[PDB]
Amino acid sequence: RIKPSDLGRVVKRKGQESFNFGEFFAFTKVCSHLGCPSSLYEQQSYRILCPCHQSQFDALHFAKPIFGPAARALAQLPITIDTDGYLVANGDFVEPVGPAFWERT
Amino acid sequence: LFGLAADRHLGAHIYDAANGGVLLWQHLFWFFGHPEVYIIALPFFGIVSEIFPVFSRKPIFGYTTLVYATLSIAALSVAVWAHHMFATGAVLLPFFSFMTYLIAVPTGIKFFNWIGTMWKGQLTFETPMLFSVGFMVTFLLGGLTGVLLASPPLDFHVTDSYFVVAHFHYVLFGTIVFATFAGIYFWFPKMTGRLLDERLGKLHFWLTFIGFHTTFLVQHWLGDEGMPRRYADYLPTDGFQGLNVVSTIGAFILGASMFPFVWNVFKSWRYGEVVTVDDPWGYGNSLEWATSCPPPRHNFTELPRIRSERPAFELHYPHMVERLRAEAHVG
Amino acid sequence: WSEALGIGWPEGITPEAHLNRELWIGAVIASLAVGVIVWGLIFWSAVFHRKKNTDTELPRQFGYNMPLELVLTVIPFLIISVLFYFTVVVQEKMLQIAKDPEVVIDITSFQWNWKFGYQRVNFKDGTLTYDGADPERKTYLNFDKVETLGTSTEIPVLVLPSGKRIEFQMASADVIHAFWVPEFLFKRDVMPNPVANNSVNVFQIEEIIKTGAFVGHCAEMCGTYHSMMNFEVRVVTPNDFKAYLQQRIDGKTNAEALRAINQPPLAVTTHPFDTR
Amino acid sequence: ALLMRTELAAPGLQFLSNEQFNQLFTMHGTIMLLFYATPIVFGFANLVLPLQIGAPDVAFPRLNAFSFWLFVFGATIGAAGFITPGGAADFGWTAYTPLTDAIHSPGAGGDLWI
Amino acid sequence: SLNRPNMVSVGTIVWLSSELMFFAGLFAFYFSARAQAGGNWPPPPTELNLYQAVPVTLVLIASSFTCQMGVFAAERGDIFGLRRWYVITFLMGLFFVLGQAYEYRNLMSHGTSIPSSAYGSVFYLATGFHGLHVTGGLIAFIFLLVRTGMSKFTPAQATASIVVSYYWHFVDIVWIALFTVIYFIR
Amino acid sequence: PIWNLGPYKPSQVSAGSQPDFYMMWTEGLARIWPPWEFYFWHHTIPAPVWVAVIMGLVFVLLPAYPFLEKRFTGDYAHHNLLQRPRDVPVRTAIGAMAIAFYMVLTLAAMNDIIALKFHISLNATTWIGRIGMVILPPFVYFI
Amino acid sequence: MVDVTYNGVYQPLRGVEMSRAYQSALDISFEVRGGLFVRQIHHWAALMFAAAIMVHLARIFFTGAFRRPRETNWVIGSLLLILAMFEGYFGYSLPDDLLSGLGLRAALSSITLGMPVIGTWLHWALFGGDFPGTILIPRLYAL
Amino acid sequence: MHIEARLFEFVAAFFVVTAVLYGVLTSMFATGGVEWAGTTALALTGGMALIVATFFRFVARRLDSRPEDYEGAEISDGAGELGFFSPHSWWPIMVALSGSVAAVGIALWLPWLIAAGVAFILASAAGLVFEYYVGPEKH
Amino acid sequence: ALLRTGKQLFDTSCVSCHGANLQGVPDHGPSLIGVGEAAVYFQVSTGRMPAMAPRKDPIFDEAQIDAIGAYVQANPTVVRNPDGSIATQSLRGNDLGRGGDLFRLNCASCHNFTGKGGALSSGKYAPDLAPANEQQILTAMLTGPQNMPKFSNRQLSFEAKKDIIAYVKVATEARQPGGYLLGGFGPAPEGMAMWIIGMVAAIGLALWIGARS
Ligand code: HEA
Ligand code: HEA
Ligand code: HEC
Ligand code: HEC
Ligand code: FES
C-alpha cells in the first residue's frame, strides 16, 4: 500500500494503465533474474531487493530494474473489490512469470 | 585515545559532562598538541642553519649560543600548553602569558644568529637561498602575528577567527614547505648523484611565493570582523564577498605551482646533469662532503681529521686553517 | 584614518572595548615598527653585501659578539614586560563583576539554536522591579516565565535597554558553545556544568552607548548546522524597553511585542536559511 | 583544500553539503598535521643523521622499517573513512570533549581516525 | 673494540620512560574527578578485599627478588641458574595474574561493572593496562628462555636478560605505586 | 545449524545466501555479470547463459593447459627435475593471474557480509568488484 | 518429500508441516546421542578435502611437473577436481532447509532452464516436471 | 659520557621547578583548587628525567674513557670490530601488517578479528625474535 | 501537570528539528502528528536520538520519557502493567510454532535467520536484535521507523505479537548446542575459519613431520 501523499510519480506502464487500484499495486514475487523470491521492501525509498544477488526495482517506475544483474520488469497483477468489500483478482497475468527461457519470458 | 575509545565502545563516563572531563580532556589534548607544532620547527631551523654557511662562505654565528637557544626552546616548550584555554576562562592567565612571552625570545635569538651569519657575505642567488629568504620573511610575519596573539584581551575577541588561521598557516607553511624544498634541492645530489635544474626551481619559487602571499594576506581583513572558522555558508547581506574570491584565486594559483616541481624532479631523476665530484655546492660543511657523491653501503671508505665544525671545508682547503683560527673571536 | 590602522575592528560600543582597541592599535604599531626594522635590515644586507664581484677571497670568519648578543637578548625583555603590565592592567578592568547588576539575563544554549531567559529586572531609579524566576524545575538549567525561544525559521531576537548594567549567565544543554558578539569585542565559551567544571559563567557590561541591531554567531565546533543559528540583539531606550517588558508580560509573541512599539518585526541584518 | 576553496567562494551552498564539508576539513587538517610533518621530519632524520654523525649505519634498521610500515598502514587505514556511507569522523581535529563521545557522532569513522 | 655502553640498554631505558609516561596519563585519568565526589567518594556498593591485594603485592616483590638473583647469576658464566630463577619468576607472576583474575571475578559478581559507576570504570582502566603489561612481560620471559635454550651463550643474551630484569623491576615499582595510591590513601 | 533455520517453502527468503566456498566463484560470477539480453523473433536469451559459457570455458581450459604450453613453447623434452618458482617468470605470472582472478571473484560475492560488518555501500562494493576483475589482473601480473 | 508434522523434541518447531528429510536430519542432530558431532565432522572434513585438493593443484601447477611424462595424470587430476566440486555441491542440499533449497533452486532451475537450445528438456528430465518435485531429493541422495 | 647526563639532569631540574611552581600557584588563587591533571604530568615527566639521568650517571660513574669522549684522539684508537647488524630482512613488514590488522579489529568491534590480530602479532614477534638463532635442520 | 513538564522538556531541544507545535520543518524532519507516544518511546529509549543514526546511549532515563510521550499524545499507546509500569513479562507468548513461522515469513527476511545483523542497499542496514527488549521491539514493530514496514494492530493478532516476542527471546539468548557460535551467518565464516585454522595446523604438522631441502 503506497502512501497516498505523492501518487503522482507513478509511471503507469504503457500496457497496464488501469491495473492499479488507488493505493494498491499487487506486484509478483519471483524475481526475473534467476527465480529467487524477493521480500526486501523499503517503504521510504520505494525499492525492492532480491537477497540472492542484490537487485533493485523502483516500485514507482513499473518495477523497472535499476541496478544489478536484473533484466526485465517484474510482473504486475490487477485487482478490484467484490460485493462484500474483499480483495479479488481482476484477471490473470499478461506476461509469463518466472525466469525467462528460450520460448518467452 | 585509549580512554576515548573505551568511552565510545563501553560508556565508562570518563569524559562525561557530569564530571570535569570537559576541562580534563582539553588540558591533556592541548598539552600533547602544542609540543606537536613545536616539534616541526626545530629541525627545519637546523636545515636553514646549515644551508646558510655554504652560500655565505662564513662560519656559523653563535654556535654555543644557538645550542643554548635550542635547549631553552626544548625545555620551555611543554610549559605553555594552557594558552589555548583563554576562551574557557578557567585557568591562570598571567602565568601562562608570561611563559609564552618568555618562550618568544629564543626564536628572536635564532633570527639574530642567522642575520649575523649572513651579514657581510659573498651571497650567491640560487634556488635554496631564495627558499630560505622566503622562509625567513614568512616566518617573521607569522611570528609577528603570534606575538600579537599572545595578549589575553586580544584573543578574547580574535580567537577562532581567520586571524589565528592566518597565524598558523603562515608559521607552519613558511617553515615546513620552504625548508623541505630547500633541503631537497640541497641533498638531492647526495642521494641520487644528479642536480636539479635552476630555472624551473626559480619559477617554482616565484609562483609559490606569489600565490601564497596573494591568497593569505586578506585573511586578517576578513577575520578581523565577524567570520569565525569552519563555516560552510553565510548570508549575502554582509560584505567580504570579493575577499573570498581573491583568496580562491590565490589558492588556485598555488594549486598549479606544484606541477613544475614534480615535473622537474621526474625529469632529473633519470636525466639531467650528473655530479661526478664530491660537494657540487662548493664550500660545504657538516662532514657529508668527504665521501663519493653516490654513497655506497655504510657510507664511508675513509675518514679525515676532526678538529672543528667544518671538517670537509678544512680538508678541501688546508691553507685557510690559520685564517680560520686567527680571526675567529674578533667579531 | 585610524579605522585602517585599527585593522577593520568595528567601532566600540562600551568603554572597555575602546580601551581594548587602544591597546590593539598600540601593539599593532609596535609590531609593524619591529617588522619594518627587521625587513629593512634584511633588505640592506641582501642588496649591498650581495655585490659578490669578480674579486673576492673570503669576507670574514667572525662569529663572536657576546656583548652585542647580550644587548639584543635583553632589549625585548623591556618591551614584553611593558606590554604584559599593560595587558594585566587592562584585563583587570574587564572583570569588575559588580555586586549589583541592573539587569540579569539567563542565556540558554542547546543544539543548533539559542534561548533567552530575562531572569529579573531591577533599576536604581526605582522605576522597574520584577523577578521572572520560575520554580517550574523539580536539572542545572534555569527556567523563567517570560522567555524568548528561537526556531529554525525564526531568527531569535534579544531586546535590551541602553546605558544599563547588564549581566549574562552561561548555561548549555549538550555540547560546547561560544556566545560571541562582534560589536561587544568580547567572547566567552558556554559549558554544560561550568560550576562542576570550575569555570566562571558570569560576565557583566557597564553600559551600551549606541543603540540598534547587531549580529551574532557561535564560535566553536558544535555539530553540523553550526553556522545557521545566528541571532540579533536590539538596544532600545529605557522607556521603550519598559513598554516592551509589560507588553511581553501579557501573552504576546516576539513579533507582536516588537511591532507594537514601532520596530521591525524580523531581524534586519540576518535572514533565515531556506535549505535546512 | 582546493575543493574546499572552490566551495567556500560564491556564498551559498553550490554543490557541497554541510556534513561533507565538516568531514572535509577534518580529513584535511588530520592529514596535513599528523601524516606529513612528522614523517617528513623523520625522513630527513633518516637521510642525514648517520651522514652528519659519521656512523656507518643506524642502530635498529628493523625498528626503522617497522616504524615506516606502521606509519604507512596507519595512514591508509585512517584515511579510508571516505568509503563509509556515513563518512569518517565529523568533528574538527581539535576533537573537543562532548561531541566525540558515543552520544554524538556515532559513525564508524571516528574509530578509524582514532 | 666494542663500545662499553650498550645501545640496547639506553633504548630500553627510553622505552621504559615512554611507558612510564603512559601510566602517568593513566594516573592523571584516575585522580581526576576523585575530588569531585564528596564524602565517601567510593560508592557504597564497593569494598576492596585487602586480604587478597597485599598477598599478590608480596608475590610480585618476591618475583622481583628472584629477578635480581637471576640477573646476578646471568652476570657470570652459567645459564641453568638463570633458567631456574626465570621459571620461578614466571610461575610467581602466573599466580599474580590468576589472583587478579579472581579479584576481577569477585568484584564483578556482586556489584560494580565498567558501565556501572565512574570509580569502577577508572579502577578497571588503571588495572587492565598493568595486567596486559604483566602478560607481555611473561611472554618476553618465555621468548628469552626459548632463545637461550637453542643457541650458545653470548653477551647479547645477557643483555636481553638484564633488560627484561629491570623492565620487570619497573613493572613492580609501578604496581606498588598504584597499590599505595589506591588501597592506602583511598 | 539447520534447526535454527526452517523447512523450505517457496514463500520464505532472506539474506541467507553465499553457499559453500569451493563453488562460490559461480555465484560471484552470476552476481557480477552486467545485464545484457538479446531479443529476436519470439525468443529471449537471458544473462546467465554468459555465466554458463564462462564456467564451461574454465572447465575446458583446465585440462588443455599442458598441450597449449607445449605448442606455445615448442618443447618436447623429458624432465625428472622440477624448477624452483623464481626461475620461470612467465608461468608464475600466469599463476598469479589465475589466483588473483579467483580471489577477486570469491570476495566479490561476499558483498553482503563485507557491507554488513564494515559499513560500506552495497552498490559501492559491487562497482569495486566490477572494476576490479578487469583492472586488477594486469597490475598483479606485472608486479 | 511428503509433508509431515514434527512433534519431536525441539519445542520451538512443534506443530509445523515440514519435509520428512528435514525431520530425519533434526532427529540425527538432536535425538541420537552424538549424531550432531558426527555430521559436523563429516562437513568439516569435506571442507578440508576441498581446501587440500585446491592447495595440491596449486603446488603442482607451481612446480611444473605437468610436462610430457605425466600429462595424463594432470588430465585425471582436473577431472577429479571437477567431479569432487560437483559432488560437494550436492552435499549440503540433502537436508533441504530453506537456504539449501534456495541455492539449488537458483542454480539448477535458472541455469538449466536458461539453455538457449535444449533448456526445458534438461530441467524436466532432471526434476520430472516442474522445479519442486517428489523425486528430486531421492535422486540427489542416490547420486 | 658526561654532557648528555648533565643536560638530562638540567631538564629534570627545570621540570621539577615547573611542577612545584605550578602546584604552589594552583593550591591558592584557584577556583578549582589543585588542577590535579597537568601537575601529575609535570611531576612524572620530571621523574622520567630524574630516573634516566640517574641511570646515565650510574653507567657513567663506573665507565672508562672512550675515544669519542676524548678530544684529540685518532681514528686508529677506535679501530676494530663493531657490533652485529641485521642484513636484508622482511619480517618487520609482516609485523606491521599484523599490527594494522589488530588496529582494524580494535577499531570496529569484532572480537574474532581482534583475537586473530593478537594471534598474528604473537606469530610475527616469534618470527622476528628467532630470525638469527635457528640452526640447520636436524633431519 | 505532566503535560507542562513534557512540553518544556521537548521545547528545550525538540523545536530545533521538528517544530514548536510539532509542525515539521520541510527540509529537516517530519511533522509528528499522527504518531503516538509509542513512536516517541521507541525512538527515545533505544538511543537513535538527535545525531549529526546507529545505536547510542539514551539521554533520558525512564522518568521524562512517559511525560514527553503523554505530551505528544495530547497533540498507538504503549502497553503498560496494571501497576502503572511498562509491561515486561505479560508480553511473552506461549505458542512458539506460530511465532517462528511469522518470523520466517516477515521478520527473518531483512535481519537474519537467527536475528543478527542484515545487509541492505545504499547505506542503512538491519541491526542485530540482541540489544533490544520486549517493550522496545513491540513498540518498534507497531511504530514503523525509517526504512521499516509499519504493521497495524488489525492485521496482526496480539497473540501473534506475544508469540513473536517469545520466539525472538528464545532464539537469540539460548546457548547453541553446536559449541562455539560463528556469528550466525552462512558458510562464509566457516570457510574463513577453514582457511585460518584448518590447513594452517595441517601444513605446520607437515613441516614438522617432513624435511626441507
Ligand atoms: C608550526 C606551527 C606553529 C608555530 C611555529 C606556532 C608559533 C607560535 N604561536 Fe601558534 N598555533 C598553531 C601553530 C603554530 N604556532 C596552531 C595549529 C594553533 C591552534 C590550532 C587550533 O586550535 O585550531 C595555534 C594557536 C596559537 C594561539 C592561541 C590561538 C587560539 O586558540 O585562540 C596563540 C596565542 O597564544 C599562539 C601563539 C604563538 C606564538 C607566540 C608562537 C611563536 O613560536 C612565534 C612568535 C615568535 C616570533 C618569531 C616573533 C618574532 C621574534 C623576534 C623577531 C623577537 C622580537 C621580539 C618580540 C617582538 C617578541 N598560537
Ligand atoms: C601542513 C598543513 C597544511 C598545508 C600544507 C595546508 C595547505 C593549504 N591550505 Fe590549509 N589548513 C590547515 C593546514 C594546512 N593547509 C589546517 C590545520 C586548517 C584548519 C584546521 C581546523 O580549523 O580544523 C586548514 C584550513 C584551510 C582553509 C580554511 C578552512 C578552515 O580553516 O576552516 C583554507 C582556505 O579556505 C586553506 C587553504 C590552503 C591552501 C590554498 C594550501 C596550499 O598550500 C595547498 C597547495 C597544494 C595543492 C593544491 C596540491 C595540488 C592538488 C592537485 C593539483 C591534485 C592533483 C591531482 C591528482 C594527482 C589526483 N586551508
Ligand atoms: C535534525 C536533527 C534532529 C534533532 C535535533 C531531533 N531529531 Fe527527531 N529525528 C530526526 C529526523 C530527520 C527524524 C525522521 C526519521 C529519520 O530521519 O530517521 C527523526 C525521528 C524522530 C521521531 C520518530 C519519527 C516518526 O516518524 O515517528 C520522533 C518521535 C522524533 N524524532 C522526535 C524528536 C525528539 C524527542 C528529539 C529530541 C530533542 C528530536 N526529535 C530531535 C532528526 C532530529
Ligand atoms: C525494510 C524491510 C523490513 C522488514 C520486512 C522488517 N524490518 Fe525490522 N528493521 C528494518 C530496518 C531498515 C531496521 C534498522 C533500524 C531502522 O532502520 O529503524 C530494522 C530493525 C528492527 C528492530 C530494531 C533492532 C534492534 O534490535 O534494536 C526491531 C525491533 C525490528 N526491526 C522489528 C521487525 C519485526 C517485528 C518485523 C516483521 C514481523 C520486521 N522488523 C521486518 C526493516 C525491516
Ligand atoms: S533472482 Fe533476483 S537478483 Fe537474482
From Swiss-Prot, chain D:
The chain crosses the membrane at residues 31-51, 63-83. Fe(II)-heme a binds at H28. It is found in: Cell membrane. Belongs to the heme-copper respiratory oxidase family. Cytochrome c oxidase is the component of the respiratory chain that catalyzes the reduction of oxygen to water. Subunits 1-3 form the functional core of the enzyme complex. CO I is the catalytic subunit of the enzyme. Electrons originating in cytochrome c are transferred via the copper A center of subunit 2 and heme A of subunit 1 to the bimetallic center formed by heme A3 and copper B. This is Probable cytochrome c oxidase subunit 1. The gene is ctaD. The chain holds residues 59 to 172 of 573 of the full protein.
From Swiss-Prot, chain E:
Its EC number is 7.1.1.9. It is a multi-pass membrane protein. The keyword Cell membrane applies. One of its GO terms (biological process) is aerobic electron transport chain. GO terms for molecular function: cytochrome-c oxidase activity. It comes from the Bacteria. It catalyses: 4 Fe(II)-[cytochrome c] + O2 + 8 H(+)(in) = 4 Fe(III)-[cytochrome c] + 2 H2O + 4 H(+)(out). Keywords: Acetylation, Cell membrane, Membrane, Translocase, Transmembrane, Transmembrane helix. The chain crosses the membrane at residues 13-33, 54-74, 79-99, 126-146, 162-182. One of its GO terms (cellular component) is plasma membrane. It is found in: Cell membrane. It is an enzyme of class 7 (translocase). Belongs to the cytochrome c oxidase subunit 3 family. This is Probable cytochrome c oxidase subunit 3. It comes from Mycobacterium tuberculosis (strain ATCC 25618 / H37Rv). The gene is ctaE.
From Swiss-Prot, chain I:
Residues 1-75, 94-172 form the Cytochrome c domain. It catalyses: a quinol + 2 Fe(III)-[cytochrome c](out) = a quinone + 2 Fe(II)-[cytochrome c](out) + 2 H(+)(out). Its EC number is 7.1.1.8. Keywords: Cell membrane, Electron transport, Heme, Iron, Membrane, Metal-binding, Repeat, Respiratory chain, Translocase, Transmembrane, Transmembrane helix, Transport. The keyword Transmembrane applies. GO terms for molecular function: cytochrome-c oxidase activity; heme binding; iron ion binding; ubiquinol-cytochrome-c reductase activity. The chain crosses the membrane at residues 191-211. Binds 2 heme c groups covalently per subunit. It is a multi-pass membrane protein. It is found in: Cell membrane. Heme c 1 binds at C14, C17, H18. Heme c 2 binds at C107, C110, H111. One of its GO terms (cellular component) is plasma membrane. Cytochrome b subunit of the cytochrome bc1 complex, an essential component of the respiratory electron transport chain required for ATP synthesis. The bc1 complex catalyzes the oxidation of ubiquinol and the reduction of cytochrome c in the respiratory chain. The bc1 complex operates through a Q-cycle mechanism that couples electron transfer to generation of the proton gradient that drives ATP synthesis. The cytochrome bc1 complex is composed of a cytochrome b (QcrB), the Rieske iron-sulfur protein (QcrA) and a diheme cytochrome c (QcrC) subunit. Was identified as a high-confidence drug target. This is Cytochrome bc1 complex cytochrome c subunit. It comes from Mycobacterium tuberculosis (strain ATCC 25618 / H37Rv). The lineage of its organism: Bacteria, Bacillati, Actinomycetota, Actinomycetes, Mycobacteriales. The gene is qcrC. The chain holds residues 60 to 280 of 280 of the full protein.
